[PDB]
Ligand binder design. Structure first.
Ligand SMILES: *[C@H](C/C=C\CC)[C@H](O)C/C=C\C/C=C\C/C=C\C/C=C\CCC(=O)O
Ligand SMILES: *[C@H](C/C=C\CC)[C@H](O)C/C=C\C/C=C\C/C=C\C/C=C\CCC(=O)O
Lengths: 293, 293
């Protein structure tokens, strides 16, 4: 049984990494690129970009531990702990060469530590629509004069006594449509059919809980990154952000400049958080062009 | 039936104000003091203060429109609209002399406009544990280095799609215990029975919705207060705030200094947000002494 349709020419498979069975979808030939999804979604957010990349790269899209069809982590949900699983997974398929990395939303949180600790393994890096966890997140406002705070879900999801799982259980499809559309500019791409697929996956009880454990570990991840960030990233990096409702605008690039020596950034107008779906054509073009250099 | 026990010597009653049937509890003799409750609670949060105050004053504690046993407003939930109902209710009982006002949490939001517009009607003012809605609220951080913030509920409650009602329905007692304890220093003062009573009141579907409509109107109240605040408050004012977890500390007095010419403030160590319950004895003493001068 597959939660999402595999593109033609790709395989759905599993690999045990440090005692955790990870699900992934893989296709193509050539140097490896790993695509890492974020909250509310799975490998499937990449399914339009994957066939295009697979024309010249080997492409792997895993499900984050506990999400999609991947088992929960055995160590923990902090960025440094999860990053181990993803780094070892990639190195099973690229043991002798650097690989490229694309990450969205908490995919950034779950990859930054292995990038900074294994810089020679990362050829090129693309990050979109999430802050790297650091002290900047403690200044984001809870409440805005216009639109909506992009950030109040940090506290909701991190609240103790399983607040979020307890309130959302039984209402998963409702909640997912609300939080996806509230963070989108081009809401019309989120058909009821597509929302059904995403909701069915994260409504699995262990996946609902896993989703929020990433936020419960966020303060730990901030403390981890305070040490890791004493070394800047050296490899070519590109940031993408939406310029519309739900987009991070100029923050994505401006923060990355503190972390990276070689970075270019783009803000996609009329696009919110969910760039692969809201703005597939320009986003795919930017990623393919950047990795094809 | 009554949702909460009425103290001896007090009456539970109703008055029509602008076509809206308001519930209140009233007792005592002498000049009028109106006590206005906040979110999650009803008139009952004042039940320990009321018998003491009624030795020197006529005391009235209404349920906010839509909450407790009061009918929802027929105009709207912004501060200026709700303050009309509370001002006219007070004037029914004190038509010939100014009255005192004590307000907690969103009771502040729902009274500040009628105080500033009807200053000759207000003898003395006591405000505790909430910002006056203004641009200062756009600074409060969404997330803290210790976990969930005190203010992310602004955005949870203001969200559309009836987000809060939909997620909290069926879990009203669970959610109320969470937000009471997350804003408390002294959780021991909240019996399981007291939490049961508050939860059963705000779980009423029109009351659960009314609770969050105050927040859906918050930005409108900010915009209203931007104009109203061009007129400073001239009556004697006291602020109170908790010094412990859940307390606003020095913010309460420091903001009030920008609104009021004649203000004194106290911060109560060992107390959080729920001052009438967490710190009943010192809070009652400070209020009684301030109003008795
Ligand atoms: C995934 C969000 C997906 C769905 C929400 C339910 C991650 O949790 C969050 C990723 C991105 C948004 C988070 C924070 C936004 C980052 C910066 C805020 C924008 C400008 C900052 C302005 C300032 O300095 O205050
Ligand atoms: C009622 C809060 C009641 C229940 C919480 C669901 C109002 O919505 C909020 C009023 C007071 C809540 C207490 C503290 C937060 C309010 C303002 C923040 C002021 C200063 C910052 C202090 C801090 O965050 O440490």
């Amino acid at each position: 049984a597959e939660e999402f349709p595999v593109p033609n020419g790709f395989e759905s498979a599993y690999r045990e990494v440090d005692g955790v069975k990870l699900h992934y979808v893989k296709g193509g030939q050539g140097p490896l690129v790993m695509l890492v999804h974020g909250f509310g979604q799975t490998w499937y957010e990449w399914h339009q970009l994957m066939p295009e990349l697979a024309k010249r790269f080997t492409v792997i899209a895993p499900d984050l531990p506990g999400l999609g069809q991947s088992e929960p982590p055995k160590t923990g949900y902090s960025g440094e702990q999860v990053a181990v699983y993803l780094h070892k997974l990639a190195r099973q398929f690229s043991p002798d060469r650097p690989f490229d990395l694309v990450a969205h939303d908490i995919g950034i949180w779950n990859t930054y530590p292995m990038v900074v600790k294994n810089q020679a393994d990362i050829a090129r890096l693309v990050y979109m629509q999430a802050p790297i966890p650091d002290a900047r997140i403690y200044r984001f406002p809870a409440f805005t004069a216009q639109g909506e705070s992009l950030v109040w879900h940090f506290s909701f999801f991190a609240a103790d006594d399983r607040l979020a799982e307890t309130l959302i259980a039984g209402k998963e499809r409702f909640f997912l449509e609300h939080f996806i559309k509230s963070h989108a500019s081009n809401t019309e791409v989120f058909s009821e059919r597509l929302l059904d697929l995403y909701a069915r996956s994260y409504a699995k009880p262990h996946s609902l809980n896993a989703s929020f454990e990433y936020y419960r570990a966020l303060n730990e991840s901030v403390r981890q990154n305070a040490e890791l960030a004493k070394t800047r990233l050296q490899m070519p990096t590109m940031t993408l952000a939406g310029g519309g409702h739900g987009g991070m605008g100029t923050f994505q690039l401006e923060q990355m400049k503190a972390y990276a020596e070689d970075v270019e950034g783009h803000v996609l107008p009329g696009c919110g958080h969910w760039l692969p779906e809201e703005c597939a054509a320009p986003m795919n073009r930017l990623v393919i062009d950047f990795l094809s250099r």
